[PDB]
Amino acid sequence: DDSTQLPLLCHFSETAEGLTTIRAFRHETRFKQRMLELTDTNNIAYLFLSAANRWLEVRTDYLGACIVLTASIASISGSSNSGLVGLGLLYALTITN
Amino acid sequence: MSTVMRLRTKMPWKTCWWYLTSGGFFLLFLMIFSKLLKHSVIVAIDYWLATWTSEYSINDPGKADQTFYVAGFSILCGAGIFLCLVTSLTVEWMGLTAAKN
Amino acid sequence: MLARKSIIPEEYVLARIAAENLRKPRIRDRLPKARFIAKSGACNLAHKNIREQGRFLQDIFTTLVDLKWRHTLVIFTMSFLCSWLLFAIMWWLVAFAHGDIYAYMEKGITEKSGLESAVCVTNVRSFTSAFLFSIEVQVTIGFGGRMMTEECPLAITVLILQNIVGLIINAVMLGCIFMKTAQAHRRAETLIFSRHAVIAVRNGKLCFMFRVGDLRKSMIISASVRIQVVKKTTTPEGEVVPIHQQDIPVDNPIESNNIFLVAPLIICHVIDKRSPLYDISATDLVNQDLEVIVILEGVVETTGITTQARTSYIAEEIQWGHRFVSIVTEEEGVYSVDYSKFGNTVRVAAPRCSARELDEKPSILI
Amino acid sequence: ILQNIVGLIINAVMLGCIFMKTAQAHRRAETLIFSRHAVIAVRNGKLCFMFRVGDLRKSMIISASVRIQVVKKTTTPEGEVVPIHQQDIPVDNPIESNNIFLVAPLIICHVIDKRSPLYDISATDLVNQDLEVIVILEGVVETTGITTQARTSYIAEEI
Amino acid sequence: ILQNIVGLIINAVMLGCIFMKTAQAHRRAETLIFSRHAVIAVRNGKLCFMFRVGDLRKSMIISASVRIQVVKKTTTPEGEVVPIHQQDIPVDNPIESNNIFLVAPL
Amino acid sequence: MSLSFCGNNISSYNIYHGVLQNPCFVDALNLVPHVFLLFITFPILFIGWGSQSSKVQIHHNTWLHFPGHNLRWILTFALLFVHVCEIAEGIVSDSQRASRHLHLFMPAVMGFVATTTSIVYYHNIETSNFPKLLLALFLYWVMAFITKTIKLVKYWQLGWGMSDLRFCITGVMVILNGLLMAVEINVIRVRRYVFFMNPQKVKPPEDLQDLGVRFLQPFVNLLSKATYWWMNTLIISAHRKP
Amino acid sequence: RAFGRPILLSSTFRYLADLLGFAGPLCISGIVQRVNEPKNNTTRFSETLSSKEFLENAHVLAVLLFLALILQRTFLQASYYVTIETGINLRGALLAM
Ligand SMILES: Nc1ncnc2c1ncn2[C@@H]1O[C@H](COP(=O)(O)OP(=O)(O)OP(=O)(O)O)[C@@H](O)[C@H]1O
Ligand SMILES: Nc1ncnc2c1ncn2[C@@H]1O[C@H](COP(=O)(O)OP(=O)(O)OP(=O)(O)O)[C@@H](O)[C@H]1O
Numbered sequence A: 001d002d003s004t005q006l007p008l009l010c011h012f013s014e015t016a017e018g019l020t021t022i023r024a025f026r027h028e029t030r031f032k033q034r035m036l037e038l039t040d041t042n043n044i045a046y047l048f049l050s051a052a053n054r055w056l057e058v059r060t061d062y063l064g065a066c067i068v069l070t071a072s073i074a075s076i077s078g079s080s081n082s083g084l085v086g087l088g089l090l091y092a093l094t095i096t097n
Numbered sequence B: 001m002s003t004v005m006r007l008r009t010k011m012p013w014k015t016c017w018w019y020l021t022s023g024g025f026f027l028l029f030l031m032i033f034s035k036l037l038k039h040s041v042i043v044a045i046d047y048w049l050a051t052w053t054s055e056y057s058i059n060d061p062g063k064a065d066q067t068f069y070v071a072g073f074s075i076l077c078g079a080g081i082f083l084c085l086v087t088s089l090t091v092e093w094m095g096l097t098a099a100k101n
Numbered sequence C: 001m002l003a004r005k006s007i008i009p010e011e012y013v014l015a016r017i018a019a020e021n022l023r024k025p026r027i028r029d030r031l032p033k034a035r036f037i038a039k040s041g042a043c044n045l046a047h048k049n050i051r052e053q054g055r056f057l058q059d060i061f062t063t064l065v066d067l068k069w070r071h072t073l074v075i076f077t078m079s080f081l082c083s084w085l086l087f088a089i090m091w092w093l094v095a096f097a098h099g100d101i102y103a104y105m106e107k108g109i110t111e112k113s114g115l116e117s118a119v120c121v122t123n124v125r126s127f128t129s130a131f132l133f134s135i136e137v138q139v140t141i142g143f144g145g146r147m148m149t150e151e152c153p154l155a156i157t158v159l160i161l162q163n164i165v166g167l168i169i170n171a172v173m174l175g176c177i178f179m180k181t182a183q184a185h186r187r188a189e190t191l192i193f194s195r196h197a198v199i200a201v202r203n204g205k206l207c208f209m210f211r212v213g214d215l216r217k218s219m220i221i222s223a224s225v226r227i228q229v230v231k232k233t234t235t236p237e238g239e240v241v242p243i244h245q246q247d248i249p250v251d252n253p254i255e256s257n258n259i260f261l262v263a264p265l266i267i268c269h270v271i272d273k274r275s276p277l278y279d280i281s282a283t284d285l286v287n288q289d290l291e292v293i294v295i296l297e298g299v300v301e302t303t304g305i306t307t308q309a310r311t312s313y314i315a316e317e318i319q320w321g322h323r324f325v326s327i328v329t330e331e332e333g334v335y336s337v338d339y340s341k342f343g344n345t346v347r348v349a350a351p352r353c354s355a356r357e358l359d360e361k362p363s364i365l366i
Numbered sequence D: 001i002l003q004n005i006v007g008l009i010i011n012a013v014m015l016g017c018i019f020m021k022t023a024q025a026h027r028r029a030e031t032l033i034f035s036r037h038a039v040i041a042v043r044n045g046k047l048c049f050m051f052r053v054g055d056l057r058k059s060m061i062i063s064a065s066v067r068i069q070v071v072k073k074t075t076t077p078e079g080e081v082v083p084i085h086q087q088d089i090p091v092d093n094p095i096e097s098n099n100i101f102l103v104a105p106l107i108i109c110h111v112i113d114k115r116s117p118l119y120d121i122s123a124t125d126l127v128n129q130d131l132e133v134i135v136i137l138e139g140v141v142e143t144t145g146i147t148t149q150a151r152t153s154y155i156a157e158e159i
Numbered sequence E: 001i002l003q004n005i006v007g008l009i010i011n012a013v014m015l016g017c018i019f020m021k022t023a024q025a026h027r028r029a030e031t032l033i034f035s036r037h038a039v040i041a042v043r044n045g046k047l048c049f050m051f052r053v054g055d056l057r058k059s060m061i062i063s064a065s066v067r068i069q070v071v072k073k074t075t076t077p078e079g080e081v082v083p084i085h086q087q088d089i090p091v092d093n094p095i096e097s098n099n100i101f102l103v104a105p106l
Numbered sequence F: 001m002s003l004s005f006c007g008n009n010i011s012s013y014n015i016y017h018g019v020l021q022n023p024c025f026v027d028a029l030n031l032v033p034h035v036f037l038l039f040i041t042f043p044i045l046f047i048g049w050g051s052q053s054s055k056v057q058i059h060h061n062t063w064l065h066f067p068g069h070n071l072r073w074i075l076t077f078a079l080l081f082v083h084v085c086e087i088a089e090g091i092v093s094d095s096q097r098a099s100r101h102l103h104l105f106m107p108a109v110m111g112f113v114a115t116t117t118s119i120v121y122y123h124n125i126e127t128s129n130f131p132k133l134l135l136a137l138f139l140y141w142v143m144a145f146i147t148k149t150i151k152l153v154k155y156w157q158l159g160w161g162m163s164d165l166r167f168c169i170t171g172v173m174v175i176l177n178g179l180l181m182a183v184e185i186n187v188i189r190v191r192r193y194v195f196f197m198n199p200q201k202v203k204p205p206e207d208l209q210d211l212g213v214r215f216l217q218p219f220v221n222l223l224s225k226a227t228y229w230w231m232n233t234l235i236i237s238a239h240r241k242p
Numbered sequence G: 001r002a003f004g005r006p007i008l009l010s011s012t013f014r015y016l017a018d019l020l021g022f023a024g025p026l027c028i029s030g031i032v033q034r035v036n037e038p039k040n041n042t043t044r045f046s047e048t049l050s051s052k053e054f055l056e057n058a059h060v061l062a063v064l065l066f067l068a069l070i071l072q073r074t075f076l077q078a079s080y081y082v083t084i085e086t087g088i089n090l091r092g093a094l095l096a097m
Helices: A002-017 A019-024 A028-076 A083-096 B003-007 B015-020 B026-055 B067-100 C057-065 C069-097 C100-109 C127-138 C153-182 D002-023 E002-026 F023-046 F070-095 F106-126 F131-158 F165-191 F222-226 F232-236 G005-021 G023-035 G051-055 G058-096
Strands: C211-213 C220-234 C240-248 C291-300 C305-314 C322-324 C345-347 D032-034 D039-042 D047-055 D061-071 D106-111 D132-141 D147-155 E032-034 E039-043 E046-050 E053-055 E068-072 E085-089
Touching (some): A019 A028, A028 G058, A083 G023, C069 C100, C069 F023, C153 D002, C153 E002, C305 D061, D047 D132, D061 D106, F023 F106, F023 F131, F070 F106, F070 F222, F070 G058, F131 F165, F165 G051, G005 G023, G005 G058
Antiparallel strands (some): C291 C305, D039 D047, D061 D132, D132 D147, E032 E053
16 A cells, blocks of 8 residues: 555656646646556555455454354353353453454 | 565564663553553452342342442442553553653 | 544655665566466466357266266265165155054054054154165165055155165266276376477587486387477468467488387487578577477377377577486496486587578588 | 066166266267368468368367368369269478367468369359368367367358 | 165275276287297398288287387487487388288288 | 154144144145255255366356345345244243154254255356256245245144244245245346246356456455455465565 | 445445344343343243243343344444445545546
């Protein structure tokens, strides 16, 4: 991501200081088809980062939910006072989050 | 530079040691002590609430002598709040001093 | 959780070695390589966008015959278990409906009756018994403490159906086992090729040589050697022949393309006018887009199966100026060859000009 | 005794039927594909007859061979009459040999010499002319080892 | 269940082995014969090398081919001394093709 | 005593006064379609379908989801959940009794395994365009409807009531199975797998065509779109090379 | 009306997941209020299930909570992914403009 954001700004900046020359030499389409490519590479880098972070969250949340089940069943069929059932349930739920 | 098979897979964990005890050595143990105390108090208030709640599960008729449970809950909650206020200040002080040095 | 809320840092300064190092090339070639066929068989072309022909269940059966031995046993066992179970359930339902379960339970709770004169299928009382009766009927065991009386015709229909389907299963599975046992010699192909190619000097002209050998104690019959050069050309009228394969003679005492393969050999190829190797020089033969294919064909007398072995050469691997060490050596009482000197090559006097000129300048000296 | 023997024979025969079925499972259908029509181009300062052959298999055809024939109603100068006579046209390789290796689609070519019957024909008047070009491609499949031969033809209307 | 499955599989394997023998029934050992001496004689005023080959079996072989080689330690002109040099030699038939018909001793 | 499927009591297996009118027999007839589907589909899926009948080195990269995609997966998941609920209710009810009467529980577990295997069949069918095979699924679902339907009516003829859990479970399952049957019919209509004039023709979808499409999140199945399986490969590829 | 539909779809999924998410506290209360009071014997129980009765089978509610959590986390994460992709497309269009 940090590697695909430096060029995407630089290009814009260039096309901002040289408008008279750029619009004279009539190379507009050659530059637009480059702005599009730069911005698309940057967007795909960001999208893959966001998908990876969400992937991690989904997997770890399912692991936490499995913990929730294996804690509730352990506390249900066991020999313990109700204080350590209520505390256990609540804390095992927060651990998941 | 062959980091991926070998360098990347292990965390730096050595520059990290320098960062942890960076501003000195007495600005770290304060953070560790305050963190552990705050976390233990934050668990203990709920533990006490559970014990008080559980001790009267059967005593349906008389909800009396509830001054001890209330006193315990209030004192533990106040102490926990104080430790919570302390710990963050300790951590931020450590970070600021480490950055300065 | 929202790592970069503070977005303010932008265009403050980066100004660095990203590519403006000036002492390191910015470019990253990354060195991808494409060859017509891989170094170890497996022709690597790219068919795509071909009008597909769908599928048909005969292809599924065709897959069934071609399986590794550690999966045929598994499919065998699963087939047998599923068949026994399915017919056990059918028998259990038949026993339920005809009023046999109730009769046996009521007259065996009190042993006073001892009545088995009116039952659909004797001595089937539970699902366990049904799943032991189905065993006694499918495998032709027939323990026979459980006869089938003649009355309930639904049971007889189920028996006919199950016996015939069981025979089908047995016949198909026996066929699979026999087919896989007959074609059991056909392990794989084990033709060993030298990797590096020399261009020595011999018999007044250059060459093109490598080494090939076998490992199976059966030599290969009617072996044939074909050598081709792969390059893109165009007509003088200019049409793009995308990857033209050109056939080139492999020299021999009578100009015929059989070779007898017992001790490893040199496979010469004299460069002459028609050969595309007329125009390649010493310092030239590191830069070129060429691919020389070698195709070996024969049959193995043991298994009686025709085999074709493929390999590929590129101009980058070929190392001018060498030849192959004489691997053989007359031993104490019998010839021998050490394949350990397979890829070993040595250097000897090698002219640096092109055979294009090795007759143009008529001095064997270069 | 009679019934047991008959049952044994019946079981053996049907077992043989299943073995033959399994053996003849693998082959499915012919798979070498020839073009809709051919071409007659100019290549290397002399006209050449070209056609296109492709493969659809996963394996490759061992020892493939291609043969080309010219069908024409013919006579002999001394008077004999030949009704649907065949012949053969020399398929060309730089080595005068006919084995061909087919992994990429290929364009088989044949060069017109003074001795092929495909030399005295005109250009405009091919479409109205009694000829036929037969292509026969044989080989041996590597996976199952069954020799196969696939055929096709091109006529005047489709050249 | 375990014993039944093992028994049926064993029956299949044994049937297959017996099938292999019943398929190789027609196979036998080496059956072509060459003399115990070559000879070197004069044929049409030319000094030529000849030997004898025969078949001692029931059928007539198809599409035979007789190839002859010389294994010798020659001297390579430029040091590529290859000790066991195999050089092919041309058999004779007025069509310049090797194939030979084997009915009687040849 | 034994390990029963209608209890340890003799009068629970009788077949007088209605062979389809005794509840345990209706339970078995419901058990039949599930095991039939399982026994047809486990060997068929195991036998593999990968025979390279042509040059398939770059043909495996394309697969086009069948006409009705999202409703089938979501409804099948709903059926899995409803069957889980029925299993749970059965287990609890058996746990409130003396013997181990199995007619409340085992049919539901068999249904669970059968629905899971049904979705397995759908996935393995879809990857390889071969529409004919999915006809099997049609039969399964259709057959299933009949059996389950009888239970409802045979409850309604005895008036078990609309307040009881079992009535709710059976009704939910009936209507969900019907909707899935509708999905199958629509697939038959759009893909032309049996008796339209001829099988239809389509071009496989355009991202997968160009080998630049790698962020394949928009192009994969909803149960895999939900647990982000599309990224899986790349992440486990973090050891080999950057 | 241009690049906003998927945000509505994400909001629908988010609302449904948010509604199902509260099953943690309620199931915790149910399980706790079942485990405490003693119910050893002699209460008539011939009829198999009463709608109200199913909800408090203490072990049962644990399974219901497990499934509810493992569904809520997946639905919420799906919502996040859809809205993220919408945002990335919106940024790309705005930069191009
Ligand atoms: N003794 C051998 N056994 C098996 N294969 C061999 C042997 N010698 C050479 N080869 C084959 O030669 C090919 C070239 O391999 P490589 O270049 O690694 O070794 P080499 O230089 O040819 O021989 P060596 O390894 O003895 O130096 C390989 O495909 C290999 O299979
Ligand atoms: N890409 C392909 N995929 C599958 N089969 C092909 C392909 N190209 C050609 N064929 C087969 O080769 C034969 C010759 O095809 P050719 O392209 O010469 O004819 P065509 O005029 O394109 O035929 P059509 O009008 O049916 O497309 C056809 O019968 C076809 O079955």
